[PDB]
Amino acid sequence: QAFERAKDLQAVIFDKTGTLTEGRFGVTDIVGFNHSEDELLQIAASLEARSEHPIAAAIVEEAEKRGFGLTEVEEFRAIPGKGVEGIVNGRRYMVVSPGYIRELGIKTDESVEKLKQQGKTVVFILKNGEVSGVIALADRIRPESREAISKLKAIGIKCMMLTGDNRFVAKWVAEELGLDDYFAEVLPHEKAEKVKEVQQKYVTAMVGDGVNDAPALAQADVGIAIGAGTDVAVETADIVLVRNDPRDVAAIVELSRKTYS
Numbered sequence: 001q002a003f004e005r006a007k008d009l010q011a012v013i014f015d016k017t018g019t020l021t022e023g024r025f026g027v028t029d030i031v032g033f034n035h036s037e038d039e040l041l042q043i044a045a046s047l048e049a050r051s052e053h054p055i056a057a058a059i060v061e062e063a064e065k066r067g068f069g070l071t072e073v074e075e076f077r078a079i080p081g082k083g084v085e086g087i088v089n090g091r092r093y094m095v096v097s098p099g100y101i102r103e104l105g106i107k108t109d110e111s112v113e114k115l116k117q118q119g120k121t122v123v124f125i126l127k128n129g130e131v132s133g134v135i136a137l138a139d140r141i142r143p144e145s146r147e148a149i150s151k152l153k154a155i156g157i158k159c160m161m162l163t164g165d166n167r168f169v170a171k172w173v174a175e176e177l178g179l180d181d182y183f184a185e186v187l188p189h190e191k192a193e194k195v196k197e198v199q200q201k202y203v204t205a206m207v208g209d210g211v212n213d214a215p216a217l218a219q220a221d222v223g224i225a226i227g228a229g230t231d232v233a234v235e236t237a238d239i240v241l242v243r244n245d246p247r248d249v250a251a252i253v254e255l256s257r258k259t260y261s
Helices: 002-008 016-020 037-048 054-065 098-104 112-117 145-154 167-177 188-199 214-219 247-257
Strands: 011-015 021-032 074-079 083-087 092-096 121-127 130-141 158-162 181-183 204-208 222-225
Touching: 002 222, 002 247, 011 016, 011 188, 016 021, 016 130, 016 158, 016 167, 021 037, 021 054, 021 112, 037 054, 037 083, 037 092, 037 121, 037 130, 054 121, 054 130, 098 121, 112 121, 112 130, 130 167, 145 158, 145 167, 145 247, 158 167, 158 188, 167 181, 188 204, 188 214, 204 214, 214 222
Parallel strands: 011 158, 011 204, 158 181, 204 222
Antiparallel strands: 021 130, 074 083, 083 092, 092 121, 121 130
């Protein structure tokens, strides 16, 4: 009777990471300071090609996405507490963290604070000891997610999100999606209580991973497990979506409102 009662949903809460987002870092911005973005990316990725760090891997992936070939680095060095460095074409290049920049006393252009305000992770590209560019990364929003939310709002459903992520990241996602509300910094044992808080007003769905978000899905009037696949089965949640397509939430509501059994 889960499908049947989806028609009376008033609120939908999405878990962020992996559900509305890809659940991995990718590049959102490349910003050159009197230096081209294509060269900046190609240089940063050449230097980053050895690293196992998740952010380094995302920089290399983006160079692969744009089809940029890497360059062999000379006098390569990895500095724990800073980043990486090597010579490329007779100039000493480095890719370093905001922590290193602050420790060296280097001034970061005022525009970079806007990236930080979106909760994006920033790395700095130095050329001969001066900031040549920054690359910003986020756990990026799924292409389907904007449409998932607009379809839901169009049918009067309040669209929310919860996440353990910090308030800058959560705000950024909410604004990109036009969410009605969001809750940030929510640890895994605190999610169920946020669903009960929304339940004070609304017949509420929770959308999330069937294993990780089990309690929240259980507290919900309708628990929707997403991205379950066709391999292993989720047995606790009210409805299971095989694929990870958040637009299927509105498809359930809209079909349920057109039908009864």
